Design a protein around this ligand. Structure first.
Ligand code: SF4
Length: 180
C-alpha cells in the first residue's frame, strides 16, 4: 500500500500521472473542489491505482475542507455519500475510465478539469506545461503536431516517451514500473 491519502500528493507518485490526472489534481488543490465529471475521472483513477475506500475518504475530505473551503459538516452533508458510492460503500462496479471514455464525455467549460488536456488546452498552455516537464521545443513541436492531427492518445504517449491500449491507469502502471 505505497498508495494512500498522503502519498498520492507526493512528487514521487504524482510524477507517474498523465496530464489529465495532473490537471484534475491541480484544479483540486487550487479550488479545494471538483465538479461532477472531474470527481469521477479522478476518483475512479485513484481507485484503479489501488487507493482504498478508507484512504479515498481521507483524501477527498481533506482536499475539500482544506484552507477552510467548507466545514466537514458540509463535506459530510453534500459529498461523502458520492465518494462512498464510487467504491460501493452503499452495487455497480464503477471501472476506471479509459482514454476513449474520457474523450466521449462532454467537453469541459470554465471551472472544469475533466477530459483530455491534449485536446482541451491551447498550444500556449501545453507548451509551458511541457517545458515544466523538461521537454525541448523539438519535442513540444512533435507533440503539438499530434494534437493538431487530433491524435491525443499519440500526443500523450509521446510525452510518456520523452519523460521516461489507451488508458490513464495504464499510463500510471507503466510509469511507476520504470521508477521501481
Ligand atoms: S490520453 Fe488518455 S490519458 Fe493521456 S491525457 Fe489524454 S486522456 Fe489523459
Amino acid at each position: 500500500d505505497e498508495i494512500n491519502a498522503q502519498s498520492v500528493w507526493s512528487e514521487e507518485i504524482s510524477s507517474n500521472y498523465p496530464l489529465c490526472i495532473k490537471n484534475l489534481m491541480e484544479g483540486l488543490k487550487k479550488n479545494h473542489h471538483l465538479r461532477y465529471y472531474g470527481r469521477q475521472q479522478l476518483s475512479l483513477f485513484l481507485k484503479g491505482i489501488g487507493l482504498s475506500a478508507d484512504e479515498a475518504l481521507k483524501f477527498w475530505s481533506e482536499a475539500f475542507t482544506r484552507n477552510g473551503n467548507m466545514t466537514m459538516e458540509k463535506f459530510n452533508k453534500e459529498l461523502r455519500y458520492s465518494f462512498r458510492h464510487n467504491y460501493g460503500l452503499e452495487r455497480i462496479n464503477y471501472k476506471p475510465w479509459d482514454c476513449h471514455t474520457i474523450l466521449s464525455k462532454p467537453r469541459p467549460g470554465r471551472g472544469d478539469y475533466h477530459g483530455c488536456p491534449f485536446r482541451d488546452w491551447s498550444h500556449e498552455r501545453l507548451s509551458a506545461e511541457l517545458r515544466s516537464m523538461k521537454l525541448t521545443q523539438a519535442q513540444i513541436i512533435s507533440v503539438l503536431d499530434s494534437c493538431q492531427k487530433g491524435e491525443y492518445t499519440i500526443a500523450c504517449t509521446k510525452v510518456f516517451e520523452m519523460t521516461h491500449i489507451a488508458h490513464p491507469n495504464l499510463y500510471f502502471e507503466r510509469s511507476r514500473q520504470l521508477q521501481k
